[PDB]
């Protein structure tokens, strides 16, 4: 763990950044999930109609 | 995730069946497209005169 | 402890397998954002598509 | 696939827009006279024979 | 990266759902009609005629 200090610091900082970006768009994430649930079903229906 | 499974399977099937067809069609359309472009000016006048 | 060790080694294997395709994983977000913007613009700028 | 579709759209969007416009102007007279096309397609085989 | 990705993904999902609710039902019909007419004109006898 000591010899890999730079790597753990770097991924800790990157986790901080990614988590901050994901939390600042919480409503965006909820909307994305709620819209991704039926849109894939609709795409599947469209494709299976022209299968 | 379930909708993604279904849509991915259906779309992958359709694309695997109809991808090389489209690729070779778009490859073979180059001479016909160049020919149609080259002799475009004699299209409107030809149709007008025949009408 | 056995679960912890197995978790760590399997995580190392999974991360090594995932990031060997470094360029595509490193550009996944940029490319998905770009294709989202392009699809949005294509649908927006062509409102006569339905009548066609 | 995301990158390839983004590149394809970024390259072919104006041409696709112009293609849709030209297709609309081509197809409007055909739809205006969609019955004459049917009548000539029905009649032509007899004349050809 | 992630914030823009999430926002653009949400927007494109909404746009895609609108597009499919608007145009998919006629796009399928167009594809079916094109397939049927091309198959009718690509039978062996129309093939040799062409």
UniProtKB/TrEMBL annotation, chain A:
Q: What species was this sequence derived from?
A: Mycolicibacterium smegmatis (strain ATCC 700084 / mc(2)155) (Mycobacterium smegmatis)
* Lineage, broadest ranks: Bacteria, Bacillati, Actinomycetota, Actinomycetes, Mycobacteriales
Placed within the complete protein, the shown segment runs 209 to 259 of 518
| Stated name of the protein | Mce-family protein mce1f
Report the coiled-coil segments.
none
Automatic annotation (TrEMBL), chain C:
Coiled-coil annotated spans: none
- Tell me the superkingdom of the source: Bacteria
User: What protein does this entry describe?
Assistant: MCE-family protein MCE1c
Please tell me the species this chain comes from: Mycolicibacterium smegmatis (strain ATCC 700084 / mc(2)155) (Mycobacterium smegmatis)
Which stretch of the full sequence is covered here? 211 to 262 of 524
UniProtKB/TrEMBL annotation, chain D:
Descriptive protein name: Virulence factor Mce family protein
Q: Please report the organism this UniProt entry assigns to the protein.
A: Mycolicibacterium smegmatis (strain ATCC 700084 / mc(2)155)
TrEMBL record, chain E:
What is this protein's name?
Answer: Virulence factor mce family protein
The part of the entire sequence present here spans 250 to 299 of 547
Q: What is the lineage of its organism?
A: Bacteria, Bacillati, Actinomycetota, Actinomycetes, Mycobacteriales
């Amino acid at each position: 763990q000591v010899n890999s200090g730079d790597a753990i610091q770097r991924w800790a900082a990157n986790l901080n950044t990614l988590a901050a970006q994901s939390a600042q768009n919480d409503e965006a994430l909820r909307s994305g999930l709620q819209q991704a649930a039926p849109t894939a079903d609709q795409l599947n229906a469209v494709f299976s109609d022209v299968r | 995730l379930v909708a993604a499974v279904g849509f991915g399977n259906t779309g992958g099937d359709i694309f695997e069946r109809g991808g090389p067809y489209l690729v070779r069609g778009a490859q073979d359309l180059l001479p016909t497209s160049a020919l149609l472009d080259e002799y475009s000016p004699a299209l409107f006048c030809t149709i007008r005169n025949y009408h | 402890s056995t679960q912890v060790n197995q978790l760590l080694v399997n995580a190392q294997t999974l991360l090594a397998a995932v990031n060997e395709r470094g360029r595509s994983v490193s550009l996944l977000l940029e490319r998905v954002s770009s294709v989202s913007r392009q699809v949005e613009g294509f649908v927006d700028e062509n409102p006569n598509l339905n009548h066609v | 696939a995301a990158g390839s579709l983004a590149d394809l759209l970024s390259d072919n969007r104006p041409l696709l827009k112009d293609t849709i416009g030209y297709l609309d102007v081509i197809q409007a007279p055909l739809v205006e006279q969609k019955q004459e096309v049917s009548d000539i397609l029905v009649q032509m085989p007899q004349a050809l024979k | 990266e992630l914030a823009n990705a999430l926002q653009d993904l949400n927007r494109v999902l909404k746009t895609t759902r609108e597009f499919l609710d608007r145009n998919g039902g006629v796009l399928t019909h167009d594809i079916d009609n094109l397939e049927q007419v091309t198959t009718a004109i690509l039978q062996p006898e129309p093939r040799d005629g062409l």
